[PDB]
Amino acid sequence: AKALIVYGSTTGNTEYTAETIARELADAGYEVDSRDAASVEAGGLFEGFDLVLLGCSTWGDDSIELQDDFIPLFDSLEETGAQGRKVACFGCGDSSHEYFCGAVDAIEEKLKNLGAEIVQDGLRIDGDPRAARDDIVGWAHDVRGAI
Template sequence: MAKALIVFGSTTGNTEGVADDILKILNKNGIPTEVKNAADVSPAGLAEGYDTVIMGCSTWGDEDIELQDDFVDIFDNMEKVGLTGKKVAVFGCGDSSYTHFCGAVDVIEKKAEALGATVIVGSLKIDGDPEASTVEEWAAEVMRMM
């Protein structure tokens, strides 16, 4: 059976809440899943032992795309994570009033693909407070593609 990892970086708690919701949905459907806060992990070998890696990161900055502080080390060292041959899905929370709404999601997907991962579903970009039904629909799509 496929095993999944959810790794997230969250400042306000929204991205963490979405990560927890996805964890509950996957576990409820019998998919062994672990969730890890980017602040508590090292990039080296992070994806080892997992078939699917779900990454969550909020976006800051109006002039440039700025990833959530705790996620920067993972992004900067993604070649050490071990994403080659892995299935990847990316989500993020943001504010559509910013120029680069959820831009972190786009750069994470692009880098993961460049490192040999397969992005299995379109990204989930959440504007403001997450709606449970939106997260559930996206998680269901992720499960179908795992």
């Protein structure tokens, strides 16, 4: 009944993606809360939520880095209340890079170590998200059925 959507986005790709997802969940009857990573703090962030969706863009010149706003959260993921919590991940990227949506893997690896429960494989979007719109909607739909 309650979902938290936390996103880290620079050029607004991931932000558009997060809000598409939320419409999908709010439509199915969930109570939704969307938050910019810049605005939140890690201590008990997952408290009171049945499902969490975390999205981030991928950066870095010579190594894989997470979006700036997300870093603090990622760093203190141990304090969010992730053990046994149902999560799913997403992000925007560019397949011209070697590690296509490398942030997604990093987060997912981190969550499993914490004992989170990963409901579905992460959504990884190439180029412009409005052109992968049906894919976003498809995923939200799948996420829903995997609960």
